[PDB]
Scaffold this active site. Structure first.
Site, PDB file in Angstrom:
ATOM      1  CB  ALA A  11     -25.906   4.629  29.868  1.00 19.80           C
ATOM      2  CB  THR A 118     -25.187  -2.941  25.118  1.00 16.02           C
ATOM      3  OG1 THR A 118     -26.177  -3.957  24.945  1.00 16.02           O
ATOM      4  CG2 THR A 118     -24.862  -2.364  23.767  1.00 16.02           C
ATOM      5  N   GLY A 119     -22.883  -1.725  26.994  1.00 24.77           N
ATOM      6  CA  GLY A 119     -21.954  -0.657  27.258  1.00 24.77           C
ATOM      7  C   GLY A 119     -20.586  -1.230  27.433  1.00 24.77           C
ATOM      8  CD  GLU A 156     -22.015  -0.470  37.045  1.00 25.04           C
ATOM      9  OE1 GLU A 156     -22.422  -0.152  35.896  1.00 25.04           O
ATOM     10  OE2 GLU A 156     -22.331   0.142  38.100  1.00 25.04           O
ATOM     11  CG  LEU A 225     -10.575  14.889  19.238  1.00 27.96           C
ATOM     12  CD1 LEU A 225     -11.403  14.016  18.278  1.00 27.96           C
ATOM     13  CD2 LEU A 225     -10.639  14.395  20.692  1.00 27.96           C
ATOM     14  CD  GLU A 227      -3.414  20.947  20.301  1.00 29.54           C
ATOM     15  OE1 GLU A 227      -3.522  21.414  21.465  1.00 29.54           O
ATOM     16  OE2 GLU A 227      -3.001  21.607  19.311  1.00 29.54           O
TER      17      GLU A 227
HETATM   18  N1  LIG Z   1     -25.087   9.828  33.359  1.00 28.84           N
HETATM   19  C1  LIG Z   1     -25.846   8.828  33.011  1.00 28.84           C
HETATM   20  N2  LIG Z   1     -25.625   7.607  33.499  1.00 28.84           N
HETATM   21  C2  LIG Z   1     -26.513   6.670  33.033  1.00 28.84           C
HETATM   22  C3  LIG Z   1     -27.581   6.872  32.152  1.00 28.84           C
HETATM   23  N3  LIG Z   1     -28.258   5.699  31.920  1.00 28.84           N
HETATM   24  C4  LIG Z   1     -27.630   4.812  32.644  1.00 28.84           C
HETATM   25  N4  LIG Z   1     -26.562   5.328  33.335  1.00 28.84           N
HETATM   26  C5  LIG Z   1     -25.652   4.598  34.236  1.00 28.84           C
HETATM   27  O1  LIG Z   1     -24.998   3.574  33.472  1.00 28.84           O
HETATM   28  C6  LIG Z   1     -25.182   2.287  34.118  1.00 28.84           C
HETATM   29  C7  LIG Z   1     -26.328   1.549  33.503  1.00 28.84           C
HETATM   30  O2  LIG Z   1     -26.020   0.742  32.382  1.00 28.84           O
HETATM   31  P1  LIG Z   1     -27.335  -0.040  31.778  1.00 28.84           P
HETATM   32  O3  LIG Z   1     -28.369   0.922  31.347  1.00 28.84           O
HETATM   33  O4  LIG Z   1     -27.756  -1.025  32.814  1.00 28.84           O
HETATM   34  O5  LIG Z   1     -26.766  -0.826  30.601  1.00 28.84           O
HETATM   35  P2  LIG Z   1     -26.199  -0.479  29.225  1.00 28.84           P
HETATM   36  O6  LIG Z   1     -24.748  -0.134  29.518  1.00 28.84           O
HETATM   37  O7  LIG Z   1     -27.011   0.486  28.498  1.00 28.84           O
HETATM   38  O8  LIG Z   1     -26.149  -1.919  28.420  1.00 28.84           O
HETATM   39  P3  LIG Z   1     -26.976  -3.297  28.826  1.00 28.84           P
HETATM   40  O9  LIG Z   1     -26.529  -3.836  30.181  1.00 28.84           O
HETATM   41  O10 LIG Z   1     -26.727  -4.468  27.865  1.00 28.84           O
HETATM   42  O11 LIG Z   1     -28.423  -2.848  28.833  1.00 28.84           O
HETATM   43  C8  LIG Z   1     -25.529   2.594  35.557  1.00 28.84           C
HETATM   44  O12 LIG Z   1     -24.349   2.740  36.313  1.00 28.84           O
HETATM   45  C9  LIG Z   1     -26.322   3.885  35.420  1.00 28.84           C
HETATM   46  O13 LIG Z   1     -26.224   4.636  36.633  1.00 28.84           O
HETATM   47  C10 LIG Z   1     -27.803   8.157  31.660  1.00 28.84           C
HETATM   48  O14 LIG Z   1     -28.685   8.497  30.876  1.00 28.84           O
HETATM   49  N5  LIG Z   1     -26.875   9.108  32.137  1.00 28.84           N
END
Ligand SMILES: Nc1nc2c(ncn2[C@@H]2O[C@H](COP(=O)(O)OP(=O)(O)OP(=O)(O)O)[C@@H](O)[C@H]2O)c(=O)[nH]1
Ligand SMILES: CC(=O)O[C@H]1C(=O)[C@@]2(C)[C@H]([C@H](OC(=O)c3ccccc3)[C@]3(O)C[C@H](OC(=O)[C@H](O)[C@@H](NC(=O)c4ccccc4)c4ccccc4)C(C)=C1C3(C)C)[C@]1(OC(C)=O)CO[C@@H]1C[C@@H]2O
Ligand SMILES: Nc1nc2c(ncn2[C@@H]2O[C@H](COP(=O)(O)OP(=O)(O)O)[C@@H](O)[C@H]2O)c(=O)[nH]1
Ligand SMILES: [Mg+2]
Lengths: 412, 426, 108
Positions: A11, A118-119, A156, A225, A227
């Site tokens: 994401a 990963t996020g 999540e 930034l 600020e």
């Molecule tokens: N705004 C936005 N939200 C996104 C996007 N892709 C994913 N999300 C949101 O972010 C979360 C998804 O995270 P994942 O894609 O499952 O995982 P990741 O954080 O990339 O990392 P992994 O779990 O290891 O794959 C969900 O809540 C989605 O709704 C995007 O392109 N834009």
């Protein structure tokens, strides 16, 4: 002077796609021009490879992009600790490596989504390391935070709490934008039933474009930034503003679009266009940065805020006598040529730390416990190990967050 | 990530032919074949299934395990057939033996090491190993028995990497095998510990779905097998394809499975319209949602009504709105609050993949976890004791050199395994 | 007997918390697992003999000379091997700690 961003997670990557993509439009650096600010990191190869295959292919250096063949896992545990660790060495070296070359880095604006293994997980350490190392630097993190109802991932809420918990000391300021929350903007404001993820990212694209790109771009008010945190954040946590865009107006359908400063600014405050679920029920507004680009007369702004201040439904917190930070940028928001965007002459973005998030955190927090007591998925986490351990201890820590947020407002 | 397929047992093998039948096409491989591939993209991920010996030749990496020469030979002699590397076949002329006991202990045992040899060779091949796939029937001596055993070594050798299972759980109404309680119960016994993700398919359920859902008057096995192959393909190969939100197996494992049992899921394909008239073009989103979720068109016997869901994962592959997909689900969730199950806040795990099943526009695989399946398990066990107490068939097993305790143990484990499911249900 | 819930919990964990693994190595070691390696333990861990076999230990089967001393050595003595920390590790393990100082001590 400059800031480097890091995009993590799929994401964060897909925003990473957007953020740059919007950028190129603005700057007018076509497909093959200069060289990028920022690197991308994902445990899951395919997605990053999307960057590799996909648009703006040359623009990044392969040095910039960091990947792993290895498995992302939708859980905090591997991504942070276990699988976690291996990548970071490359990652950090990248950031320092990049950092070294630039002169006078302000800091890194890291993007991530709460949001995934990963996020979460991976990133959390990454920022974690940064605080020690860079330290002096300002560390903002841009996060996308679980849609209240919507959340895709089963796991999540496990991820987010840990992510928020871990990072919290580390980050100077973190922006949070809500995925479904934005959707309402899409649905009502532009009226797309269709919108893809690409759309949202575009939306974020615009909003982010103000913060990094425009601001650094010289302009009348010029906001740093530094600020951002300084004015924005009252307190040592970590505090997470929401980000708002007035001009969201649909490209094709409706053309009011000359909506002068008063109206546009006015637009944001209404709960509709937050890009956050938050919809300030109670929420107090500690502080705001409003950054405007376009043709703005500061009188127009100054008058505009004054009326807003008075209407007093808004009800700022007592302790801040006033907390309005105007920022004016010369050059108008740049709309991606075709697709959705209104292409208003002037636009407002406004961020703020509001009491309201406390509502979100509580809800977010609540999700965690329900699973946790049953303990749920945790076996996955413990396996990555992780321990009972982080979850609960983290759990309390963010619990502190709720108190912290609540205490800040609601009392005088 | 790479995945290796396993075919154990005739059913086993029969499905394997079909599975690759689709998959090969899905990848765009001709029999000895190469990547004719209409699109470029399909080429890239392929490695999961295949190895690149020739350059022309991408040969599917998976093993065929079967005591029955006949079954395997037909498969080789059959259409795709030739594609497999001959090494892949691990065979034993020895009598197939209906016995689970025969397959596991006596007959199977000798072969297994030989089997394991190749599994490693495929395993060792290159890149990183996601894990193995399995098809078989609870079934029979080769289907279970050896196959159930085979996983065991797999579990030991690489614990980290994941196994998904497909089992044809014995069809309730009339069992295609007399023995049915015996083989099935013991076999599942192994999986429940062994394989981290299992999928069940039931034949009659297939009949039911095929027969109602598709106009199809004459279901053939090749049909049921074919439909079955449909789900797993969505699962495995699809996610290897790009997606705005794409899960992979581990995502499927992590999100889907609350508890260590590994549990069992029921596949369900999004598109299921007759040839023909039924082609509505109401794929849009919601029609898909209705299809999968609905009580029927559930591959396994059990009906979700019964029926609560630990987890749901929908891997849609096709280009659809994130907005609609995510949003639509919620209404499903709210609409069916009773069954969904309260504790886990967001039941459905949503996967989106850009590219659809090569022929068709928009489809989601539906996978995952529900309490209902427990009902299924009771069936096998219930048969089990009625058979067991009288011990009618048993001598074959024990003569084969099996234990009395063993029978009891297997049943109870699965049996209480049923019990586990209920706990969440309430 | 002991609920499976405890068992799988440790096993499935792709990489157990280290001291847990070390502990498992120790316990497996008490079992006298020849192999250092995980996998050999792993398949060992789930095996029909395993479930009961631990629970009842024939005294005669266990052999004093090598086996006694290593355990006695103050592996327990170890700086954090012993009961209290390990006990934190799990509810399940806890009853075991009692076992270590138990009949074994008394008879010998
Ligand atoms: N705004 C936005 N939200 C996104 C996007 N892709 C994913 N999300 C949101 O972010 C979360 C998804 O995270 P994942 O894609 O499952 O995982 P990741 O954080 O990339 O990392 P992994 O779990 O290891 O794959 C969900 O809540 C989605 O709704 C995007 O392109 N834009
Ligand atoms: C002209 C046209 O559009 O024909 C369609 C068609 O008529 C329909 C009825 C297809 C057709 O499927 C069946 O009739 C069917 C037969 C036995 C068991 C199950 C299904 C089709 O045969 C199946 C075929 O499916 C594919 O091409 C997918 O890629 C699919 N492929 C296979 O199953 C496959 C079949 C033979 C050889 C190799 C692969 C797939 C699905 C999921 C994952 C991977 C691949 C499609 C769209 C059609 C025909 C050709 C008529 C349908 O099925 C699928 C799986 O798409 C049945 O309901 C759907 C709706 C489709 O519109
Ligand atoms: N779907 C499906 N089921 C099958 C096929 N072949 C046998 N079965 C089922 O498998 C069970 C019989 O086990 P079998 O495969 O003969 O065992 P084995 O060959 O001795 O390992 C019955 O319940 C059948 O309905 C098949 O090609 N497709
Ligand atoms: Mg990802």
């Amino acid at each position: 002077r400059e800031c480097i961003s890091i995009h993590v997670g799929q994401a964060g990557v897909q925003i990473g796609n957007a953020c740059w993509e919007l950028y190129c439009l603005e700057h007018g650096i076509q497909p093959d021009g200069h060289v990028p600010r920022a690197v991308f990191v994902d445990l899951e190869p395919t997605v990053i490879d999307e960057v590799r295959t996909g648009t703006y292919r040359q623009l990044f250096h392969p040095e910039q992009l960091i990947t792993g063949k290895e498995d992302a896992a939708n859980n905090y545990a591997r991504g942070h600790y276990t699988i976690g660790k291996e990548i970071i060495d490359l990652v950090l070296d990248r950031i320092r490596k990049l950092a070294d070359q630039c002169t006078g880095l302000q800091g890194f604006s890291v993007f991530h989504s709460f949001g995934g293994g990963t996020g979460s997980g991976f990133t959390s350490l990454l920022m974690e390391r940064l605080s020690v190392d860079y330290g002096k630097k300002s560390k903002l993190e841009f996060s996308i935070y679980p849609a209240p109802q919507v959340s895709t991932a089963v796991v999540e809420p496990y991820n987010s709490i840990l992510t928020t918990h871990t990072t919290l000391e580390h980050s100077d300021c973190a922006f949070m934008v809500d995925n479904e929350a934005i959707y309402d903007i899409c649905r009502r404001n532009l009226d797309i039933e269709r919108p893809t993820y690409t759309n949202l990212n575009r939306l974020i694209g615009q909003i982010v474009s103000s913060i990094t790109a425009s601001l650094r771009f010289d302009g009348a008010l010029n906001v740093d930034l530094t600020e951002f945190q300084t004015n924005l954040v009252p307190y040592p946590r970590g505090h997470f503003p929401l980000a708002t865009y007035a001009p969201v107006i649909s490209a094709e359908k409706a053309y009011h679009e000359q909506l002068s400063v008063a109206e546009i600014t006015n637009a944001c405050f209404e709960p509709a266009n937050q890009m956050v679920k938050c919809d300030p029920r109670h929420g107090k507004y500690m502080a705001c940065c409003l950054l405007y680009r376009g043709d703005v007369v500061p009188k127009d702004v100054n008058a505009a805020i004054a009326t807003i201040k008075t209407k007093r439904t808004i009800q700022f917190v007592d302790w801040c006598p006033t907390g309005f930070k105007v920022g004016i940028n010369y050059e108008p928001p740049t709309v991606v040529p075709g697709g959705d965007l209104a292409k208003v002459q002037r636009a407002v973005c406004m961020l703020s730390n509001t009491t309201a998030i406390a509502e979100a955190w509580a809800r977010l927090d609540h999700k965690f416990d329900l699973m946790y007591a049953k303990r749920a998925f945790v076996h996955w986490y413990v396996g990555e190990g992780m321990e009972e351990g982080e979850f609960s201890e983290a759990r309390e820590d963010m619990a502190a967050l709720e108190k912290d947020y609540e205490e800040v407002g609601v009392d005088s | 990530r790479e995945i290796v397929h396993i075919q154990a047992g005739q059913c086993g093998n029969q499905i394997g032919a079909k599975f690759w039948e689709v998959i090969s096409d899905e990848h765009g491989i001709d029999p000895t074949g190469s990547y004719h591939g209409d699109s470029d993209l399909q080429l890239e991920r392929i490695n999961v299934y295949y190895n690149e010996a020739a350059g022309n030749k991408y040969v599917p990496r998976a093993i065929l395990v079967d005591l029955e020469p006949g079954t395997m030979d037909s498969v080789r002699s059959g259409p795709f057939g030739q594609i497999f590397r001959p090494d892949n076949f691990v065979f034993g002329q020895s009598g197939a033996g209906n016995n689970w006991a025969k397959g596991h202990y006596t007959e199977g045992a000798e072969l297994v090491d030989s089997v394991l040899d190749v599994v490693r060779k495929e395993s060792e091949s290159c890149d990183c190993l996601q894990g193995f796939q399995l098809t078989h029937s609870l079934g029979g001596g080769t289907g279970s028995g050896m196959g159930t055993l085979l996983i065991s070594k797999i579990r030991e050798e690489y614990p980290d990497r994941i196994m998904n299972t497909f089992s044809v759980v014995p069809s309730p109404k009339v069992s295609d095998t007399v023995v049915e309680p015996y083989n099935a119960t013991l076999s599942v016994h192994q999986l429940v510990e062994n394989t981290d993700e299992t999928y069940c398919i039931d034949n009659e359920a297939l009949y039911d779905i095929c027969f109602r859902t598709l106009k199809l008057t004459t279901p053939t096995y090749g049909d049921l097998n074919h439909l079955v192959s449909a789900t797993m393909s969505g699962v495995t190969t699809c996610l290897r394809f790009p997606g705005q939100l794409n899960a992979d197996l581990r995502k499927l494992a992590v999100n889907m499975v609350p508890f260590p049992r590994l549990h069992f899921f029921m596949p369900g394909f999004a598109p299921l319209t007759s040839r023909g008239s039924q082609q509505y073009r109401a794929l849009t989103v919601p029609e898909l949602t209705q299809q999968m979720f609905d009580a029927k068109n559930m591959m396994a016997a059990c009906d979700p009504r019964h029926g609560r869901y630990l987890t749901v994962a929908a891997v849609f592959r096709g280009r659809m709105s994130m907005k609609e997909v995510d949003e639509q689900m919620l209404n499903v969730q709210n609409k069916n609050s009773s069954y969904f199950v309260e504790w886990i806040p967001n039941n459905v795990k949503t996967a989106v993949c850009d590219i659809p099943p090569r022929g068709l526009k928009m489809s989601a695989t539906f996978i995952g976890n529900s309490t209902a399946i427990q009902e299924l398990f009771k069936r096998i066990s219930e048969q089990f004791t009625a058979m067991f107490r009288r011990k009618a068939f048993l001598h074959w097993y024990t003569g084969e050199g099996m234990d009395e305790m063993e029978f009891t143990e297997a049943e109870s484990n699965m049996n209480d395994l049923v019990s586990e499911y209920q706990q969440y249900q309430d | 007997t002991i609920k499976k819930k405890h068992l799988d919990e440790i096993k499935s964990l792709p990489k157990p918390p280290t001291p847990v693994k070390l502990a498992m190595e120790a316990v497996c070691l008490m079992l006298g697992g020849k192999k250092l390696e995980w996998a050999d333990i792993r398949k060992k861990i789930m095996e029909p003999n395993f479930i009961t076999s631990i629970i009842n230990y024939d005294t005669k089967k266990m052999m004093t000379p090598k086996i006694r001393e290593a355990i006695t050595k103050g592996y327990l003595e170890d700086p954090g091997f012993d009961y209290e920390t390990v006990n934190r590790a799990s509810k399940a393990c806890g009853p075991l700690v009692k076992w270590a100082t138990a009949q074994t001590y008394y008879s010998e």
